[PDB]
């Protein structure tokens, strides 16, 4: 029998049919090979396992046999699941830039990377530069961004404008940007976002010994721990430089440093596979950070 | 239980 397949990624959807037997690998491969993607070291196939989980698809196993939710067509997300340490040096495809872009933006917007008015109102420009290309007096009249999601909730929340007002705003920041390239622009806007203090970093919640509540951040540069009440400012940093060795037993994990005078870092995740996520999440992150520190 | 050993 047929297993019937579908792969979004962020502009984009593909289905096709897929054998009993075909390999996470080969299921990847051929959606990078359609998409014409050269640059597949960022990216992961995202799916949902029986349980619920948000799952990454294993390149060395059967497609088939990794336990998706099993619905007629099976379902997977084509992601960025690392990002890089400096988007401008780091993504030269085209094709690579604007998935991220698009990423990362749409996170910008459902309030998941923090991100401040100010910065929020000068990325949305790019954005709309992006979409319309240069302002034009003639074609671009009052309100046509009334239909457009160009702002962080949040945003719109805490500073109250009205809608035409933030929209006036971004136009002025729009009219600016007169003879950017759709393509600059987006750079652009990412360069802006890879300094946000929330990007391209996964966040788990944890508790130490004593059972308060924290976040755990794994990133390109390596571990940091957060208060619950703040996900922006580490609490303490651990970069992969001053980091010996990660452990997990059951839900207790364990960071053990370099220097030998420093207390090895102790959190409880609340289920065992909760560590098994955050030990491969680490160990991918880790490897491309020395990977892109060899030739 | 698992472990990993970065630098």
Request: glycine share 4%; with cysteine.
């Amino acid at each position: 029998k047929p297993i019937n397949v579908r792969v979004t990624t962020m502009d984009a959807e593909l289905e096709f049919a897929i054998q009993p037997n075909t390999t996470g690998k080969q299921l990847f491969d051929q959606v990078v090979k359609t998409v014409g993607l050269r640059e597949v070291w960022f990216f992961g196939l995202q799916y949902v396992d029986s349980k619920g989980y948000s799952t990454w698809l294993k390149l060395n196993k059967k497609v088939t046999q990794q336990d998706v939710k099993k619905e007629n067509p099976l379902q997977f997300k084509f992601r960025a699941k690392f990002f890089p340490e400096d988007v401008s040096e780091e993504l030269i495809q085209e094709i690579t830039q604007r998935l991220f872009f698009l990423q990362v933006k749409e996170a910008i917007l459902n309030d998941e990377i923090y991100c401040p008015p100010e910065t929020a109102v000068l990325l949305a420009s790019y954005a709309v530069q992006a979409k319309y290309g240069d302002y034009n007096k003639e074609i671009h009249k009052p309100g046509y961004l009334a239909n457009d999601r160009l702002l962080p909730q949040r945003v719109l929340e805490q500073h109250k404008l009205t809608k035409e007002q933030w929209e006036e705003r971004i136009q002025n920041w729009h009219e600016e940007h007169r003879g950017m390239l759709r393509e600059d622009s987006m750079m652009e806007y990412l360069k802006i976002a890879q300094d946000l203090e929330m990007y391209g970093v996964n966040y788990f919640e944890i508790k130490n010994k004593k059972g308060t509540e924290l976040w755990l951040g794994v990133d390109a540069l390596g571990l940091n721990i957060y208060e619950h009440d703040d996900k922006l400012t580490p609490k303490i940093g651990f970069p992969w430089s001053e980091i010996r060795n990660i452990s997990f037993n059951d839900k207790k994990f364990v960071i053990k440093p370099i220097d030998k005078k420093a207390p090895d870092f102790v959190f409880y995740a609340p289920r065992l596979r909760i560590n098994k996520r955050i030990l491969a999440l680490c160990m991918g992150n880790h490897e491309l950070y020395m990977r892109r520190r060899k030739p | 239980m698992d472990i990993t050993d970065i630098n």
